[PDB]
Assembly symmetry: C3
Homo-oligomer: 135 residues x 3
């Protein structure tokens, strides 16, 4: 019956909420990060250039939320890649892989019917606050 | 190598299962709640009135499952809103927000191809059993 | 500020990765398992026979990943069943139920627009390493 830490993670380096959600919630040591679109943090608008540019921006936004929680991409344990078009799998994979210098997280990836704002990709993530042990 | 608590959460105040799943599982302090449709608990039928009425019922059902586990909406840390139609985002958001009097959970929301029973909305949730600390 | 265990789970009894992900990640006591298609572990090809055969293979693959982490299906706490066609719900349920001899996990199940490789079903899972307590 200990009181576990629960903290809302919020940074102006990631887009403002455009509905009733927080950017991320840290609870105990697990960080649940809200799905990120390829939105520019300053404007809230999707960046032009289609799925590859959107994917880069979405991952940049996750990176800023991780940083706010004292983490980096090495703390991610599970991610989800939602696509508007399954044909973009290869292209998104090549972007995604550049954000992990070490062992990849668990992952799910597939096509949904529609994302908010007509996005072409959304990235969701679960991280665990460090320190974490090595193999 | 402690033995962690794992408990099936079951209440007659939420719909009966219509396949091989439990309403929720508590494991350690985390509660994984099965996605709820706008089903009436007594009948198992979707409530009439479309997405807004379904969303209200789905959230009521989650509330009853949280209550069974000694929790309320303040214990939710992450939710997922699956829509049959992305155009219902605004309407569902206005329903959803009424269930959180405090800081919102992390969230994902988007359109899938089809839900069981022709539902227009499904709400999934992860909660952590209290006590939880405040900011 | 303890260092929590984080381990990549990898077994040749499940399919090789065909992108930048691990089969599963164990972190503390929670195991996040990447979504499994009905892929033959030796070939990486989808097994013939459609959704029922694919579902059996996907669940077999999850079973091998659980075994690698010292677990079995009784350790699963939450699963997700993604379908290419909602009409396959009954058939997939009858396969799925055969993998749980005890109380079912929490679950989500619904239709997405498309899965990798034209799969008809994907199964995702979260498990917790034992020992777990009984009711």
């Amino acid at each position: 019956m200990s009181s576990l830490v629960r903290r809302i993670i919020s940074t102006a380096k990631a887009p403002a909420a455009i509905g009733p959600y927080s950017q991320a919630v840290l609870v105990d040591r697990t960080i649940y990060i809200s799905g990120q679109l390829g939105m520019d943090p300053a404007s809230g608008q999707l960046v032009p250039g289609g799925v590859v540019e959107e994917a880069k921006q979405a991952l940049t936004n996750i990176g800023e939320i991780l940083k706010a929680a004292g983490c980096d991409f090495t703390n991610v344990v599970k991610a989800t890649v939602l696509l508007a078009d399954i044909n973009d799998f290869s292209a998104v994979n090549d972007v995604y892989k550049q954000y992990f210098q070490s062992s990849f997280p668990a992952r799910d990836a597939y096509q949904v019917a529609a994302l908010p704002k007509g996005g072409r990709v959304e990235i969701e993530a679960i991280a665990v606050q460090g320190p974490l042990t090595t193999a």
